[PDB]
Amino acid sequence: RIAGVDIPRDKRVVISLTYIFGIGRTTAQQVLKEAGVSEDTRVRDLTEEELGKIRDIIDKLKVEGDLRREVSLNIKRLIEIGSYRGIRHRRGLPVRGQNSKNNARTRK
Amino acid sequence: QYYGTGRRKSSVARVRLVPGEGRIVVNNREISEHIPSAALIEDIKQPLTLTETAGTYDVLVNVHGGGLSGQAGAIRHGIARALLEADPEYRTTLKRAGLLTRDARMKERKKYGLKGARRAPQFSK
Amino acid sequence: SLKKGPFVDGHLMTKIEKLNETDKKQVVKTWSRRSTIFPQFIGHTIAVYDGRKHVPVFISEDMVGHKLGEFAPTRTYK
Amino acid sequence: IRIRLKAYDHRILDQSAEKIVETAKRSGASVSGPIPLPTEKSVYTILRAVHKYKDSREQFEMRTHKRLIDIVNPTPQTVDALMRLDLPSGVDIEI
Amino acid sequence: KGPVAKRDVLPDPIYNSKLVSRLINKMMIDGKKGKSQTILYKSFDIIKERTGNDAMEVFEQALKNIMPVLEVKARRVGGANYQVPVEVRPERRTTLGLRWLVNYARLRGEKTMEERLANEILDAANNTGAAVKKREDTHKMAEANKAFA
Amino acid sequence: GQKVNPVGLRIGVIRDWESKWYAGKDYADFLHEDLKIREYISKRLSDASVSKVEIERAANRVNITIHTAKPGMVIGKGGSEVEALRKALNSLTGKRVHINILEIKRADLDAQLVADNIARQLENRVSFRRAQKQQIQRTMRAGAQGVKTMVSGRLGGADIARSEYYSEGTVPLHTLRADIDYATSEADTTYGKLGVKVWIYRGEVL
Amino acid sequence: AKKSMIAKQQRTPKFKVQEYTRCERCGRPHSVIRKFKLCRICFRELAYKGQIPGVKKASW
RNA sequence: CCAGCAUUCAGUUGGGCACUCUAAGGUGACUGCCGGUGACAAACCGGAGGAAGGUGGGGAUGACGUCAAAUCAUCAUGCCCCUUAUGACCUGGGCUACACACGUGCUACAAUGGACAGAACAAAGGGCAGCGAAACCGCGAGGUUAAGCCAAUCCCACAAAUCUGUUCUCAGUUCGGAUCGCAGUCUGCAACUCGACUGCGUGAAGCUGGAAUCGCUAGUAAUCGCGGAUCAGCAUGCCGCG
């Protein structure tokens, strides 16, 4: 697959492409705005000239590994420079600014 | 040419009966144009159906305020009182079928300390 | 903030321009946790007040975009 | 010509109602009726206890009702009469 | 105290009955008439079609395989857990049939309740059905506990 | 939680206001300038036994009606005492203050001054026994269809504080046609701080 | 801290955000009303002596 | 407010006090009256008329006292205690910590749903350094300038659920929306601890919850939005409204 990980062949055009890491719903709409494929066809049933225009737009964006690097780069950045928000990423506690006596069960 | 007013659940209806054929026009809109759910379409027609007044009077409607079932609910009182003006004979037939009450079930006010005007919030022990 | 520039206090901009003009020198007890970090601050060590002491911290080429309040542990835990 | 009365008490206002109307009628000013208007009112809610008892409230409501006066003709004899009007200050006449 | 009855609204646009509107008052999740009415009139159109009959004669004949004869009330003496046979009023035959309709209808599991309710009625018209045994097991509770009155 | 103060339960329906004007742009700062008036006039004229004050904001005029039951302590010469009043208040307000004084007939029927006389006798070291029953017979012989007095607190004793009735006649707190004067007044004693609740039923309206 | 807390509100603070509310009769924060500049308890006992010209009991 | 009367993109221009509505004064319901009941009394049962029938629905109103129930931290406060400090002022921190239990609240675990589009419908409250239209620009939160409004005139404010199409097809998914990254906007001296809200991404836990418990007699149960106090700023909070 273009992302290196598949889309299911029977879903619609927008939502199958949202399984691509880094690509959500509104990122899919900007691509298909440039593609112009009406967004409701079987993605088992396309042409490659149609899908070659799908490829190079994905080639233009931070999609597969690059978006996996740079946030993990930022995690490795801010922890190793102190930077208290680094410690909240570090210990297993919330980051964005919350209390602590309450639930916070996404991180312990 | 008979006239009436209609009030039910905080909304105002003005009903006047010109001699026509049964067409009901709601502030230059129609019934299905303005009110879906044909349950209420036979319900707004209920004062028209008991007395033999089927295809003989067109209705001008001034719906003001409120929501749809309260709006249409105001008309099904206002149709009656406007058609009370025609003949007071069948008033006794209508009054035994209700339809003249102006239902006093206004939405009650929220108490302080209670959520939904009768609901106590919760309880512990 | 968005477009007013990164916020500094007048005393912070004063002594660091006295620091940058000649030579890097002793640490500075700031009471301005609130202030940002400018790219001129790199290599300047300063003392941030934590609530009960001024903790000395370092500024490098990576600790640039944030404020000074990222380096003030005010709530110690175990 | 637009004159608006807005007060707190229905006893004072209705007593002060014809004080403008009938006296301006004496010089023939063609004054409209004392038209009422909806009451801009307000609700204050305050805990009845000193310290505890958030769920036991003590509501207080402030009502300011108002009635309207319009005059068609100028009639400058009434302008001297409207200037010399002497009322209890709860009504706060404004022209 | 004493007996206190409540009110009800007569008509029906289609299938001009009284008890059908009581079923419209059933499955009214959170105050939605027409959202349940959209479920209802689409169902009976299939019921008129999928079985080539008038849906009224399908409806109450299915109800007769649901409408019970005996309730069971109780009696606690120590820990004996006694039961009481109860004659079901002609009020309660109308009411408790609707509960045993709609609860098991939405619990079966298909695409929409347009399809859940429609095949449930045929499972009570042709009375081989899951909700029909709910009537039957109460008789099995009534047949054992008959001895008391 | 005990009985609601029956003045404010009757204010507006039967009993008129005291503060009377209309709110424009300054309705907070009308009150502060007027609450300083009532604290000033109760300061200097507590000895003069001034009961109640009504205030009119009268378009750069301040009209104060005064209820006392004697002018002879309050006007003095007639010109002497009232000029010291208006000179102080015009300095306190910053604008004109017009002063009029109304005498109260039957001084043993006004709740602000009937309760005040008890607190004078308590600070003069008189026990409650002779206190309340003398006060009630003043009110009953003056004409009153019901009088309820109550002094609550330490009785000059050591610790065990308690409320104490003495009342006669009809006190209809829940007939909404009342005309009931109600006021309280504190008392500074040697063994603490006595409170006095006194309210008088005068007769309802038909 | 009472009379300084009356005084600090009646001074000029370092910034206009550091204005707060205080009722000037029983001076405490936590609900001084903006319209009256009066406190939560001090609204009530002053209402029951014929004062605060508008407010009566509430029932509708 | 708009029926009749034309003019109108439009109650707009006229014009009008009908109707609606506004708010002052009456009026009406009292077991008054009919029948039956018991005693014939009170009162009960039924019927009539009537907008309304048995204290019409609701509010406000809470007897004597109970618990030495609550508040010296609203105030007042006797007594005790403090005083170059237990008083006053400033910065900054903290009241927001978190291995873990508990109440109390919302958003959900979906097909009565999700997504998009169309159509239509409220009540009450608020606005002077206060609301800010329209307009333009930003994907947007908004920015820009700015009419009008001290207000039934102008603005907040285009209500949501609803209805009708389209698409979705039963799975941890087109449900979920936390958690978290980056990019932003506002207010304010200043948003790091410690604000709200968008924009992009990320997409867990959970697929009706054990013993046990809680609310509710008719516009209530649940459900959906909106207004306001409080405030520079901030609500799943509480009032209040349909």
Lookup: tokens for D41: 């009112």
Q: What is the resolution of this structure in A?
A: 4.5
| Binding site as annotated, residues of G for Zn(2+) | 23, 26, 39, 42
Which residue does chain D place closest to B120, by CA atoms?
A: D55
The distance (Å) linking the CA of F10 with the C1' of H217 is: 34
The distance of Cα E89 from the centroid of its chain, to the nearest Å, equals 14
Q: How many residues does chain A have?
A: 108
Residue at the smallest CA–C1' distance to nucleotide H75: G26
Apex G51 CA angle, G47 and G52, nearest 5: 75
CB F116 within 8 A of CB F49: yes
C–A contact (≥3 CB pairs within 8 Å)? yes
Q: SS3 string of E109-146? A: CCCCHHHHHHHHHHHHHCCCCHHHHHHHHHHHHHHHHH
Q: What are phi and psi of F188, to 5 degrees?
A: -95, 105
Q: What are phi and psi of E61, to 5 degrees?
A: -70, -35
CB C49 within 8 A of CB C19: no
Q: What are phi and psi of B60, to 5 degrees?
A: -100, 130
CA nearest to F69, candidates F47, F50, F82, F41: F50
The distance (Å) linking the CA of E75 with the C1' of H37 is: 37
Distance from C-alpha of A58 to C-alpha of A66, rounded to nearest angstrom:
12
CB F30 within 8 A of CB F45: no
Lookup: tokens for F139: 């009110």
Enumerate the β-bridge partners of residue C57.
Answer: C46
How many CB atoms within 10 Å of residue E41? Answer: 15
Pairing of strands B12-19, B57-61: antiparallel
The distance (Å) linking the CA of E130 with the C1' of H111 is: 22
Distance from C-alpha of D6 to C-alpha of D93, rounded to nearest angstrom:
7
Q: Using the beta-carbon criterion (under 8 Å), do D88 and F56 form an inter-chain contact?
A: yes
D–B contact (≥3 CB pairs within 8 Å)? yes
Question: How close B17 gets to chain E, by Cα (Å)?
Answer: 25
Lookup: tokens for B57: 């009077």
Distance from C-alpha of B70 to C-alpha of B68, rounded to nearest angstrom:
5
CB G56 within 8 A of CB F11: yes
Alpha helices in E51-112 (DSSP H): 55-64, 90-108
D45 touches chain B (CB under 8 A): yes
Distance from C-alpha of D8 to C-alpha of A107, rounded to nearest angstrom:
60
Q: Which of A74, A83, A88, A108 to mutate to test the interface with C (most CBs of C within 10 A)?
A: A83
* Strand H nucleotides, any atom under 7 Å to a protein CB: 2-3, 19-25, 48-52, 56-65, 68-71, 73-78, 87-105, 111-113, 120-123, 125-126, 128, 150-152, 159-164, 167-170, 174, 178-182, 184-196, 199-204, 213-224, 229-232, 238-242
CB F182 within 8 A of CB F7: yes
3-state DSSP call for residue E39?
helix
CA nearest to G37, candidates D60, D44, F27, D51: F27
Q: How many residues does chain G have?
A: 60
Residue-by-residue DSSP string for A50-76: HHHHHHHHHHTS--SSHHHHHHHHHHH
Enumerate the β-bridge partners of residue D41.
Answer: D63
Chain C residue numbers with beta carbons less than 8 Å from the beta carbon of A77 are: 62
